[PDB]
Design a protein around this ligand. Sequence first.
Ligand SMILES: Nc1ncnc2c1ncn2[C@@H]1O[C@H](COP(=O)(O)OP(=O)(O)O)[C@@H](O)[C@H]1O
Ligand SMILES: O=C(O)C1=C[C@@H](O)[C@@H](O)[C@H](O)C1
Ligand SMILES: [Cl-]
Ligand SMILES: [Cl-]
Ligand SMILES: [Cl-]
Length: 163
Amino acid sequence: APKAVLVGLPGSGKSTIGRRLAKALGVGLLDTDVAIEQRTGRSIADIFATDGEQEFRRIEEDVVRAALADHDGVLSLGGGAVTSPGVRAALAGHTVVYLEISAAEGVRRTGGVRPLLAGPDRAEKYRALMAKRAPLYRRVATMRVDTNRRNPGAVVRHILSRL
Ligand SMILES: Nc1ncnc2c1ncn2[C@@H]1O[C@H](COP(=O)(O)OP(=O)(O)O)[C@@H](O)[C@H]1O
Ligand SMILES: O=C(O)C1=C[C@@H](O)[C@@H](O)[C@H](O)C1
Ligand SMILES: [Cl-]
Ligand SMILES: [Cl-]
Ligand SMILES: [Cl-]
């Protein structure tokens, strides 16, 4: 089982903190998004525009379950994995770190790709994403970490200390 599973909105820091957390613990980082693009050979943005969410979610879910079982390092899920009921059930019992972030900072971090965030009105879309998913992240989380006024190193240490 992963030493920690990272969840949160896009831009909350799953990929960044996961890497640094991994390097700290001395284990590998498995980023479900990355893993996906491999089992598919295609990019996530292309799977979205070619198969849609329901399909990306089933793939994601299959990767997540596998990772939860075979990966002992740090696991970082895709921003919306928690929307799949199967992913939420598979997480039960695991160490799940919920990286919290405000909508203002979150949107500014994701400035620069995300199929669900992209295009105009990212502030509105980001906020909608938060309203929808906030409840889900909180349900699966065993550890909530506020990343608003904490630089990466501080978030990593805050987590390391509570593991
Ligand atoms: N604690 C933090 N404070 C400052 N910037 C951060 C923090 N965590 C993440 N970032 C930055 O925010 C951007 C998105 O982080 P990323 O790990 O890609 O998010 P996610 O994997 O959740 O989409 C990156 O450029 C990263 O350097
Ligand atoms: O918030 C989401 O639904 C997503 C976030 C990214 O990490 C990727 O998993 C993909 O772009 C979907
Ligand atoms: Cl399983
Ligand atoms: Cl590992
Ligand atoms: Cl299960």
